[PDB]
Amino acid sequence: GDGKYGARDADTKIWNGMVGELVYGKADIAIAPLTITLVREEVIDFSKP
């Protein structure tokens, strides 16, 4: 959506981007250059780099 990366908002605290689409079940997988970070490993799982 609108070219958003896996990022969690600060005010509304809503996950937007590929991680957001995976959290709310809108998508099944995200084969994209997504950096593995601790903030995203908590909500969605990551494969080996």
Binding site: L22, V23, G25, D28, I29, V43, I44, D45, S47, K48, P49
Partner: protein
């Protein structure tokens, strides 16, 4: 997604593609093969080890020009009987 069926198979497939060499092959395919600058860019064997030819060619040109002017002078000298 956490608890999805595709997690482990993709986790293993990434390692399978990296150990086979397909990931590096795709990297070289879409980065260097399709790159407009295929070979090395602006890279010489070594960055000015000595002196360049264009650097002395000007002195050589002023030498040739002086020799030509001296030939002209000799041409007007022998004609004077």
């Amino acid at each position: 997604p956490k608890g999805s069926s595709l997690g482990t198979p993709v986790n293993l497939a990434v390692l399978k593609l990296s150990e086979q060499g397909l990931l590096d092959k795709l990297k070289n395919k879409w980065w260097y093969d399709k790159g407009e600058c295929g070979a090395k860019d602006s890279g010489s064997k070594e960055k000015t080890s000595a002196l360049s030819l264009s650097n002395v060619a000007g002195v050589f040109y002023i030498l040739v020009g002086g020799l030509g002017l001296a030939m002209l002078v000799a041409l007007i000298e022998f004609c004077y009987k």
